[PDB]
Scaffold this active site. Structure first.
Site, PDB file in Angstrom:
ATOM      1  N   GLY B  29       0.818  -1.231   0.000  1.00  0.00           N
ATOM      2  CA  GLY B  29       0.000   0.000   0.000  1.00  0.00           C
ATOM      3  C   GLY B  29       0.842   1.267   0.000  1.00  0.00           C
ATOM      4  O   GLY B  29       2.080   1.162   0.133  1.00  0.00           O
ATOM      5  N   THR B  30       0.192   2.430  -0.133  1.00  0.00           N
ATOM      6  CA  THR B  30       0.837   3.773  -0.149  1.00  0.00           C
ATOM      7  C   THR B  30       1.281   4.132   1.273  1.00  0.00           C
ATOM      8  O   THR B  30       0.764   3.518   2.225  1.00  0.00           O
ATOM      9  CB  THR B  30      -0.087   4.864  -0.709  1.00  0.00           C
ATOM     10  OG1 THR B  30      -1.151   5.088   0.217  1.00  0.00           O
ATOM     11  CG2 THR B  30      -0.659   4.523  -2.068  1.00  0.00           C
ATOM     12  N   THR B  31       2.192   5.098   1.405  1.00  0.00           N
ATOM     13  CA  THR B  31       2.787   5.512   2.701  1.00  0.00           C
ATOM     14  C   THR B  31       1.779   6.368   3.472  1.00  0.00           C
ATOM     15  O   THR B  31       1.198   7.288   2.867  1.00  0.00           O
ATOM     16  CB  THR B  31       4.111   6.262   2.508  1.00  0.00           C
ATOM     17  OG1 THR B  31       4.908   5.556   1.556  1.00  0.00           O
ATOM     18  CG2 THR B  31       4.875   6.414   3.804  1.00  0.00           C
ATOM     19  N   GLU B  46       0.140   9.579   1.646  1.00  0.00           N
ATOM     20  CA  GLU B  46       0.492   9.649   0.206  1.00  0.00           C
ATOM     21  C   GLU B  46      -0.709   9.142  -0.603  1.00  0.00           C
ATOM     22  O   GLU B  46      -1.129   7.990  -0.364  1.00  0.00           O
ATOM     23  CB  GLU B  46       1.757   8.820  -0.040  1.00  0.00           C
ATOM     24  CG  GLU B  46       2.079   8.566  -1.502  1.00  0.00           C
ATOM     25  CD  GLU B  46       3.252   7.624  -1.730  1.00  0.00           C
ATOM     26  OE1 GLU B  46       3.835   7.670  -2.828  1.00  0.00           O
ATOM     27  OE2 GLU B  46       3.578   6.841  -0.813  1.00  0.00           O
ATOM     28  N   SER B  74      -2.823   2.244   5.605  1.00  0.00           N
ATOM     29  CA  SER B  74      -2.166   1.776   4.359  1.00  0.00           C
ATOM     30  C   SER B  74      -2.596   0.334   4.090  1.00  0.00           C
ATOM     31  O   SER B  74      -2.807  -0.408   5.069  1.00  0.00           O
ATOM     32  CB  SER B  74      -0.669   1.891   4.465  1.00  0.00           C
ATOM     33  OG  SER B  74      -0.277   3.242   4.659  1.00  0.00           O
TER      34      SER B  74
END
Ligand SMILES: [Cl-]
Ligand SMILES: [Mg+2]
Ligand SMILES: [Mg+2]
Lengths: 204, 243, 222, 195, 4, 250, 244, 231, 241, 196
Positions: B29-31, B46, B74
């Site tokens: 996943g994204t930060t 993010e 995330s």
């Protein structure tokens, strides 16, 4: 519309010397109308005797229910139920229907096969046990039976004398009640013989 | 073997491989980060701009619980939403009975016990999200990070997603360089920088920054989104640091 | 009915009358209203006779199972809490008015429970129709630091007040003494001051007085 | 509903049942058969609350007919009466009890004996030489007490029944439009068409 | 029933 | 969520074996030796107290349990499975008997109820059988003294004397030589201690041995007086001291 | 999910057999032999106890022969625990019938209901069937003396003489050889013991390894008596026939 | 491979294969295009036929007077999810006298799809949806995927060769967003977008399905001779 | 081999899922120790905070179940908190129903009975935790009762749990061989805590700072955990002797 | 029944009589109508003894379980739990409860919960049958930030009048003092308060 006094009827039990007696009238009516003069209120499961007064549909229902239960008891225990144990079973069964009760006045009578002790007990409609040395009374002429038993009864009567006392107690009580009488039955119970006598009484 | 095919099954090691596999979905996943400050917490995430067709500022990922708790996660975004929905029910029933708004540690265990419950049966899948959350209660500020296993601790700083190691390294520097504490307005600017630095591990697509914060002085103890002038100020701070 | 509980220095004593009645008629001349919840927890019941027996028997059972599970002698507060939660659930439809008394590791205790699920604490209590006659005696004679023999005398005197002055109460006095570090002693028929006088006449009938229609042997065997 | 009589004689049971179906101040029907055949040698007459009577009678009929098919065997009149009583005994403590009173007249083929059972809506069962339900009993019971003999023939039983119907037509307030009479014996159930 |  | 295991985990193999019962019996075999001997005027049940650690207080762990005032139970196999069976056995003695008849169930009927619980774990959905064999000693007025074994299958047999678990084969051979129908309770306790010494390896004293009897009524253990018919429990657990007394005259 | 661990106890083989019923019958084939022989004036139930130990209490024991009511008994072959579940159900079904009709339950009705319960476990519920075969010996006023057997399939059939459990093949050949229709109870008692004596896996048949019961009209006038034989009574009947 | 038996199982790399296989059902589905300005939102759907004798599978469903979607994948699943939206839109009206926000509509679909991906026995929804609507914050377009991921966009496309229309809209973004107070021109841009996803086949009269919602326009679907204007 | 996946018997009569739940116990790599004084019961556990971003005050494997009862866990924190919440709910309900505070040994039995159910019921997995319950019971006095995934539980004179449990156990065994008694013959709990830490240092062969340890203390009518400064005060006492 | 809670400088004080009556007969003349739900959260019970006892037991459990998880509850939290039970079961309850507690932040607080199940935070509260006779007296005499001795006198004089006029109120005057110092029980006998 008082369930305990629609059909009418009486049961009385007494203790003697190494013996018990249980007696009942034979009347089943619908208030004023007498319907049956053969309606016996005393049953037995082995050597344990149960008399039931009150609403006749419940008298029949409870007899069938205790036969059912004492039969399963015997198959599992491999022996006949004793009066003291059966008394508890009756109490349990009645209180199970505490907020919708059987309109009955049951009376247990019998001799313990092991100890040879005469045993009688009465119950209220919700299943409260009334244990007594002398006598138990039940039905529409319970007042009359209480008056007769309390005056006539004496301890350690022989089976033949006890028969006369319980019979005169039932007959004279039944004749002062409109909804009781129309014939009577007396069981004389000894350790290993039981005599059943039908009494002659006035048919009004 | 075959110990990894079913959830709630112990391997001979004493491990639940299905939970470890859920962690891989989180790592993918994204930060997302959390920074505990003087009198509150700051959350940042993010948002990968897949396409020009994405409407800016209109795919909000940070969620509020009650009026005083912020949640960001995330991994599988839907799993995160399911966990927040539960959190909102837990916070509502707590307020209903006890009148007071749910304390953050109390709230943390309500999520913790729920996520842990999804590791007890093979009829449910573990949560595919690490959840960074916290806010302000009667005892002050609290930041938490909750993992698929149901494991959660209190944090000074938290990071999860693809750029977690980059973000953690940057968080560890803030903790060392500010022992007395970081201010709410400072934490917002640092949060921006750390997301921009953590974007180096996800640099194919360019991204959109999203920040929220609870602060006893700045937001009056309530959760609010950082928007307009304060947001652009934080973006400009982050843009200056990468160059 | 007349049931009382009295606390002395090293124990509690409960006493009750022996009269059970349906309407104005006396159903049982000598009925025991003292019930064993546990070996050292005893209870005296007034109200619906069936209800008091049943509720005492049920909790007595659950206390025994609890005692075996915890490997500990049961406490009076456990019996009290289980009773009053059960009675409250049924909103007074179970007409059980109990004086609960006993000794346990914690000490000696005396409580009263009402059908609706309210509970009282006291050094002397009285429940039933004869309670006002009993409480009059208790209020007149009770003091702090009663001995065992004084507490038995006070308790039995309070029951006697009910027996004589209350129509609902009569016959004999049952007592149970629960002393700390000793087995509880159940004194059934402690006092029998209402013995029936010799009848003027024997009503033993001459044999054959009753007219009989039929005789038959009943088969009780298989 | 109102009048249902039963007379057990030597070799048969006879059920008389009034034909009137009244509602309000209108006799809607004067040819109603207040009876169902439960099995070839068992007949049940019924009286009581409107709707309940037929609904109960047919329900019992279905159950006895099901038993007959399953076991390829006819249940004894004693067995059927015991089953019916238990159903009413259940009913009385229901939310809405069956307010139905029944007479079960049957011929036990194993014993070669007629049997008459009187069961009220409470589930109060009695075996009788003669039975009645409602106000009918107040006239017929005293009349039968006098005139009834246990060794009577079917023809004597019908004459004894005529004496009951005549007394009821004389002293009963309501017009019950005569009775349908049916005989249960070793040869099964048949209806007397001229009464 | 009975009372006490 | 919810118990989706609504199907049997114990099924018949082609050979006709019920695997999970056979494997439960294997778990009992691994279990520590317990035995029961029936005398004319009582019953004795005994077992070794295998201490998990010397720091552990083996008094707190009771392998021999009171079920009713006149019935006791001991086991071989998995202790946890035994503990919950004792809880269920005690409750079923009340709910299915004492609350109906106002008296405690006879040994055979309580055994039958325990057997029923263990049989249901053999057939019910999403459960393994119990990994224990029980020895239930008890007395009742109409049957007198009795000793019963209950296996994971739910099968129970009455015994004059027997052993179960680790060294049951050797222990049973030993009891066969010593047992007669004229054994007094003290003679049965003596044999129980001799038989148990063979299977026990380490320490053999009142602290490593758990032993209870079903004998005479104990009015002193009743806790109250005044009711002549109530004469106290027949089940009595022998103290650490009472065992050591009999180990001197061994 | 849990699908992985489902044995699927209630499915068909390609051949159209019920795996769990077939394997339950294989289980029963290792159980102690139980024989039922129906005579014109009573029924005999004989059953061999499974390899007895010398310290087993023999007199206060019930493994094979159980009482359902005053008129019906069963001989068991298979898991005793499984049998006792079904026996308690049968005992209740008998009392339910008596309560309803005020008449003792006909034998076949009781057998059908118990067999219908077993059938249920083979078609639905996903539970293992009962590893039990029964021999029902009973009397009613319709068919008189009746022998039945039921098996885990829930299929039941009527018999004149039948065996269940171990060595039924050998046992059924010997019964088929020496049985005849005009046989008396005392003759059936002898046949039952002679059959077990030859088909036994033991060295010699003794009283302590046997359970025995008769359902005669040997009571006083038109009433049935059940006799579950005492150890000493089996010892006497074993000497009387000359097996020991 | 071993981890695609059910939705409750993760793969060693942290994938849900049953959700990915449900996603695959959308790619097989017929192309549908969504795009909006500030005043109007438009759905354009290429309907698919079994053969020349069959009707063309209706792709567009109305949810309320101000909201509706187009579908790509399992049509029965689209019927379940659309029916759920109708109820949630209707609940908002009756209880709160309030038109349901298009954003909340998305959140409700997301949470409904999610529950099917975490529980044993159930399966993911096998359909993608493009929800258009006009609420109190103007025009909206949503893309629903049965993973639970809901995304608010200016324009998008889902189904087979949707990449063609999606690339076109990405180029045309600046043009079509400012087609305000002109329904017909916004539709033309949507019809030109879906044309980039065509191979061998072209847009006919019973093939093309167009829907529109806007400021003074209730959600209304155009089929048959009504769409002949735009070919 | 699906007999290793759920709690059913293997051919050799074993439950592999119970055995593997035991191995999950040591996954934290933390050693706990419990000893009894005259008036008190002391439990100590290692406190390892490897991450520098963690709030060290929130890192705890010791729980306050009731006012009187304390509990330390050897195993993963999710299962530890699962067990803690249940134990708290059970102890609260007990007091409400039976009108007196739940004893330490009775709670241990209750939690052990719950643990047993997970070993017999298939749909529930065992918790990968060993629960050490400590109190000063009003009847039994100072009490240590420990629960494991098997559903086993027993009272202890003293106990240790974790990877290097055997080294700590033999260290304590050798002391009680020497002292010839069932407890630490000490008046103040402060010195019983000092004993506990001293004997853990000798067994493990490591030195402890204030942040390397976590201490719980049970007295009559309350159980309480020691702050970093409470432990630091205690470490200073040991060092100066 | 006569009960009251008064908030003063150092915390709060709970006051009540000791008389429980069935009809015109006194069942208990030494009732303890002041009950503990937490260490420094106490309540005053008026109405059905059975109902008020049952309620009090449930809340103590709730606040004990609250303390296990989230530490010491606020007096407001305790009043909220009382309200929740009283309001949701208003059809089956006859209970007028005064909740009084001492926080260190909030100091002394008094919440009154009448029959309805409504919550009212007050500087002092009075409830039960006897309260009616002392509304005039209590209103005229109450002052905020009284001393301990002033508050004890205020409660003693107030309940003294309530007891004098109410048949349903009598016996001893029990009081419970909640301050930072701890919990102090006080009792006052007829021979003292009657001749005030
Ligand atoms: Cl438990
Ligand atoms: Mg007359
Ligand atoms: Mg009638």
């Amino acid at each position: 519309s008082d369930p305990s006094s629609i059909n009418g009827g009486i049961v009385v039990a007494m203790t003697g010397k190494d013996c018990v007696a249980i007696a009942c009238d034979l009347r089943l009516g619908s208030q004023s109308l007498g319907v049956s003069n053969k309606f016996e209120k005393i049953f037995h499961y082995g050597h344990v005797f149960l008399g039931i007064t009150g609403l006749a549909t419940d008298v029949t229902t409870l007899n069938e229910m205790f036969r059912y239960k004492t039969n399963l008891y015997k198959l599992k225990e491999e022996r006949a139920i004793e009066p003291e144990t059966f008394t508890q079973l009756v109490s349990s069964s009645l209180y199970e229907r505490r907020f919708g009760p059987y309109f009955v006045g049951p009376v247990v009578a019998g001799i313990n096969s092991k100890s040879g002790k005469p045993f009688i007990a009465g119950f209220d409609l919700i299943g409260c046990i009334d244990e007594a040395k002398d006598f138990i009374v039940s039905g529409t002429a319970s007042d009359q039976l209480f008056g007769m038993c309390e005056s006539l009864y004496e301890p350690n009567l022989e089976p033949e004398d006890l028969f006369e006392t319980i019979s005169q107690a039932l007959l004279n009580a039944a004749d002062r009640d409109a909804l009781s009488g129309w014939g009577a039955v007396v069981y004389i119970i000894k350790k290993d013989e039981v005599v059943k006598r039908y009494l002659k009484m006035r048919q009004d | 073997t075959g110990y990894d095919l079913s959830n709630s099954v112990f391997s001979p090691d004493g491990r639940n491989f299905q939970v470890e596999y859920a962690v891989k979905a989180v790592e993918n996943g994204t930060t997302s980060i959390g920074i505990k400050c003087n009198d509150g917490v700051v959350f940042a995430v993010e948002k990968l701009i897949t396409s020009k067709l994405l409407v800016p500022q209109k795919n909000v990922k940070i969620q509020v619980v009650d009026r005083h708790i912020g949640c960001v996660y995330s991994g599988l975004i839907p799993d995160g939403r399911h966990l927040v929905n539960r959190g909102r029910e837990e916070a509502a029933s707590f307020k209903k009975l006890y009148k007071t708004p749910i304390p953050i540690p109390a709230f943390a265990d309500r999520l913790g016990q729920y996520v842990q419950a999804h590791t007890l049966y093979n009829s449910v899948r573990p949560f595919g999200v690490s959840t960074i959350f916290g806010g302000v209660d009667k005892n002050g500020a609290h930041l938490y990070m909750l993992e698929p296993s149901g494991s959660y601790w209190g944090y000074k700083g938290a990071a999860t997603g693809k750029g977690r190691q980059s973000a953690k390294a940057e968080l560890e520097k803030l903790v060392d360089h500010h022992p007395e504490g970081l201010s709410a307005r400072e934490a917002v600017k640092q949060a921006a920088k750390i997301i921009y630095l953590a974007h180096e591990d996800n640099k194919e697509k360019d991204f959109e920054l999203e920040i929220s914060w609870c602060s006893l002085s700045e937001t009056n103890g309530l959760h609010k989104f950082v928007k307009g002038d304060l947001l652009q100020e934080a973006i400009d701070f982050a843009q200056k640091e990468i160059n | 009915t007349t049931i009382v509980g009295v606390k002395f220095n090293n124990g509690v004593v409960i006493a009750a009358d022996t009269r059970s009645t349906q309407g104005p008629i006396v159903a049982d001349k000598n009925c025991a209203k003292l019930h064993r919840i546990s070996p050292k927890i005893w209870c005296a019941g007034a109200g619906t006779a069936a209800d008091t027996e049943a509720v005492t028997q049920l909790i007595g059972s659950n206390i025994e199972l609890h005692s075996l599970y915890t490997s500990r002698e049961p406490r009076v507060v456990s019996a009290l809490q289980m009773l009053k939660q059960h009675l409250f659930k049924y909103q007074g439809h179970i007409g059980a008015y109990l004086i609960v008394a006993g000794v346990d590791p914690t000490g000696s205790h005396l409580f009263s429970i009402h059908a609706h699920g309210s509970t009282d604490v006291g050094y002397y209590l009285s429940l039933g129709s004869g309670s006002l006659a009993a409480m009059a005696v208790l209020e007149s004679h009770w003091k702090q630091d009663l001995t065992k023999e004084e507490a038995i005398k006070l308790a039995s005197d309070a029951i006697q007040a009910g027996i004589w002055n209350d129509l609902g109460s009569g016959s004999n006095v049952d007592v149970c003494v629960m002393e700390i570090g000793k087995d509880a002693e159940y004194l059934r028929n402690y006092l029998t001051p209402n013995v029936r006088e010799e009848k003027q006449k024997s009503y033993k009938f001459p044999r054959g007085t009753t007219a009989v229609l039929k005789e038959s042997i009943v088969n009780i065997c298989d | 509903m109102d009048i249902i009589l039963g007379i057990r004689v030597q070799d048969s049971v006879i059920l008389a049942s009034s034909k009137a179906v009244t509602r309000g101040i209108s006799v809607l029907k004067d040819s109603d058969d207040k009876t169902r055949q439960l099995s070839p040698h068992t007949l049940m007459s019924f009286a009581g609350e409107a709707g309940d009577t037929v609904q109960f009678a047919e329900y019992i009929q279905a159950n006895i007919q099901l038993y007959s098919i399953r076991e390829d065997y006819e249940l004894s009149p004693q067995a059927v009466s015991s089953f019916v009583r238990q159903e009413l005994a259940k009913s009385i403590r229901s939310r809405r009890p069956y307010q139905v009173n029944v007479l079960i007249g049957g011929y036990d083929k194993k014993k070669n004996k007629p049997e008459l059972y009187q069961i009220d809506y409470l589930g109060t069962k009695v075996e009788l030489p003669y039975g009645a339900h409602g106000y009918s009993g107040f006239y017929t019971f005293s009349l039968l007490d006098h005139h009834y003999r246990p060794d009577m023939t079917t023809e004597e039983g019908l004459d004894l029944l005529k004496l009951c119907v005549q007394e009821l037509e004389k002293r009963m307030p309501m017009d019950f439009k005569g009775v349908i009479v049916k005989i249960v014996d070793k040869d099964g159930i048949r209806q007397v068409d001229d009464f | 029933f009975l009372y006490x | 969520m919810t118990d989706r295991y609504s199907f049997s985990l114990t099924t018949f193999s082609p050979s006709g074996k019920l695997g999970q019962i056979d494997y439960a019996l294997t778990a009992v075999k691994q279990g520590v030796t317990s035995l029961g001997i029936k005398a004319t005027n009582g019953v004795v049940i005994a077992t070794e107290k295998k201490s998990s650690s010397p720091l552990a207080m083996s008094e707190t762990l009771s392998k021999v349990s009171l079920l009713t005032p006149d019935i006791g139970a001991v086991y071989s196999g998995m202790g946890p499975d035994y503990r919950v069976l004792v809880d269920k056995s005690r409750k079923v003695a009340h709910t299915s008997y004492k609350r109906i008849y106002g008296e405690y169930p006879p040994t055979k009927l309580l055994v039958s109820e325990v057997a029923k619980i263990m049989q249901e774990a053999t057939q019910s959905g999403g459960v393994r059988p119990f990994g224990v064999s029980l020895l239930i000693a008890g007395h009742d007025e109409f049957n007198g003294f009795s000793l019963y074994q209950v296996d994971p299958s739910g099968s129970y047999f009455p015994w004059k004397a027997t052993a179960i678990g680790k060294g049951s084969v050797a222990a049973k051979t030993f009891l066969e030589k010593r047992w007669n129908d004229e054994l007094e309770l003290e003679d049965a306790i003596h044999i129980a201690l001799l038989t148990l010494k063979e299977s026990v390896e380490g320490e053999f004293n009142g602290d490593t041995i758990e032993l209870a009897i079903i004998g005479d009524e104990n009015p002193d253990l009743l806790g109250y007086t005044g009711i002549p018919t109530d004469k106290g429990p027949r089940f009595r657990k022998l103290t650490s001291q009472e065992i050591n007394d009999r180990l001197e005259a061994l | 999910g849990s699908r992985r661990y489902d044995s699927r106890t209630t499915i068909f083989s390609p051949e159209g057999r019920l795996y769990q019923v077939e394997y339950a019958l294989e289980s029963i084939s290792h159980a102690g032999t139980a024989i039922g022989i129906m005579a014109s004036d009573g029924i005999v139930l004989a059953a061999e106890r499974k390899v007895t130990s010398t310290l087993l209490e023999q007199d206060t024991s019930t493994e094979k022969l159980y009482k359902l009511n005053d008129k019906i008994a069963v001989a068991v072959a298979g898991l005793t625990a499984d049998a006792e579940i079904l026996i308690n159900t049968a005992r209740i079904h008998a009392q339910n019938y008596l309560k309803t009709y005020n008449e003792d339950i006909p034998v076949e009705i009781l057998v059908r209901r118990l067999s219908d319960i077993k059938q249920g476990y083979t078609q639905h519920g996903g539970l293992r069937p009962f590893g039990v075969s029964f021999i029902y010996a009973g009397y009613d006023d319709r068919y008189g003396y009746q022998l039945y057997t039921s098996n885990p399939s829930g299929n039941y059939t009527g018999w004149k003489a039948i065996s269940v459990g171990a060595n039924t093949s050998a046992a059924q050949t010997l019964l088929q050889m020496d049985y005849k229709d005009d046989m008396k109870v005392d003759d059936a008692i002898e046949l039952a013991l002679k059959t077990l004596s030859k088909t036994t896996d033991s060295s010699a048949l003794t009283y302590d390894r046997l359970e025995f019961a008769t359902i005669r009209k040997g009571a006083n006038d038109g009433e049935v008596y059940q006799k579950i034989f005492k150890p000493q009574e089996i010892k006497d009947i074993l000497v009387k026939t000359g097996i020991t | 491979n071993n981890y695609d038996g059910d939705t409750v199982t993760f793969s060693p790399t942290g994938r849900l294969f049953q959700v990915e296989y449900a996603l695959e059902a959308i790619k097989q589905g017929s192309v549908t295009v969504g795009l909006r300005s500030n005043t109007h939102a438009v759905l354009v759907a290429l309907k698919r036929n079994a053969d020349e004798l069959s009707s063309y599978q209706k792709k567009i469903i109305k949810c309320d007077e101000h909201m509706g979607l187009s579908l790509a994948g399992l049509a029965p699943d689209a019927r379940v999810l659309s029916n759920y939206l109708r109820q949630q839109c209707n609940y908002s009206s009756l209880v709160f006298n309030r038109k349901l926000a298009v954003e909340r509509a998305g959140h409700l679909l997301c949470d409904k799809a999610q529950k099917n991906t975490q529980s044993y026995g159930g399966r993911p929804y096998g359909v993608g949806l493009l929800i258009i609507g006009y609420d109190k914050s103007g025009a909206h377009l949503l893309e629903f995927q049965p993973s639970g991921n809901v995304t608010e966009l200016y324009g998008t496309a889902i189904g087979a060769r949707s990449q063609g229309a999606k690339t076109y809209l990405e180029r045309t973004l600046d043009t079509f967003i400012k087609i305000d107070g002109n329904p017909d021109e916004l539709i033309k841009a949507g019809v030109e977008a879906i044309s980039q996803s065509l191979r061998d086949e072209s847009l006919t009269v019973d093939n093309l399905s167009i829907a529109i919602v806007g400021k003074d326009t209730p959600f209304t679907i155009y089929d048959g001779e009504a769409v002949a204007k735009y070919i | 081999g699906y007999d290793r996946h759920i709690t059913i018997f293997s051919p050799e009569g074993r439950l592999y899922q119970v055995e593997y739940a035991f191995k999950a116990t040591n996954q934290t790599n933390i050693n706990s120790l419990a000893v009894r004084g005259k008036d008190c019961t002391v439990v100590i556990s290692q406190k390892k905070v490897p991450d520098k971003l963690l709030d060290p005050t929130t890192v705890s494997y010791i729980f306050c179940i009731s006012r009187t009862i304390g509990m330390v866990v050897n195993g993963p924190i999710p299962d530890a908190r699962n067990a803690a919440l249940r134990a708290k709910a059970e102890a609260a309900e007990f007091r409400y129903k039976y009108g007196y505070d739940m004893p330490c040994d009775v709670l241990a039995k209750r939690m052990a009975n719950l643990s047993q159910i997970y070993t017999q019921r298939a749909y529930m997995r065992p918790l990968g935790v060993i629960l050490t319950f400590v109190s000063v019971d009003e009847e039994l006095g100072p009490s240590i009762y420990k629960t494991d995934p098997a559903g086993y539980y027993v009272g202890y004179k003293a106990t240790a749990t974790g990877p290097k449990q055997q080294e700590i156990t033999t260290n304590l065994e050798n002391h009680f061989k020497k002292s010839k008694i069932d407890h630490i013959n000490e008046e103040s709990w402060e010195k019983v805590v000092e004993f506990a830490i001293t004997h853990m240092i000798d067994a493990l062969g490591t030195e402890f700072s204030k942040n390397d340890l976590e201490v719980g203390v049970a007295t009559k009518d309350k159980f309480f955990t020691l702050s970093a400064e409470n432990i630091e005060e205690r470490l200073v006492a040991i060092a100066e002797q | 029944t006569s009960i009251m809670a008064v908030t003063f400088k150092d915390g709060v004080i709970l006051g009540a009589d000791s008389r429980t009556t069935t009809g015109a007969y006194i069942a208990n003349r030494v009732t303890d109508k002041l009950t503990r739900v937490h260490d420094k959260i106490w309540c005053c019970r008026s109405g059905s003894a059975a109902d008020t006892q049952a309620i009090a037991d449930i809340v103590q459990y709730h606040l004990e379980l609250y303390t296990s998880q989230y530490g010491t509850p606020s007096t407001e939290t305790a009043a909220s739990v009382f309200k929740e039970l009283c309001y949701e079961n208003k059809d089956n309850l006859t209970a007028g409860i005064i909740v009084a507690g001492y926080d260190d932040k909030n100091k002394g607080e008094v919440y009154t919960i009448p029959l309805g199940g409504s919550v009212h935070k007050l500087p002092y509260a009075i409830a039960g049958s006897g309260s009616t006779f002392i509304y005039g007296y209590c209103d005229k005499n109450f002052r905020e930030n009284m001393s301990k001795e002033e508050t004890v006198d205020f409660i003693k004089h107030s309940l003294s009048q309530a007891i004098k006029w109410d048949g349903s109120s009598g016996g001893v005057i029990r009081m419970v003092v909640l301050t930072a110092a701890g919990v102090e029980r006080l009792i006052f006998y007829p021979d003292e308060y009657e001749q005030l």
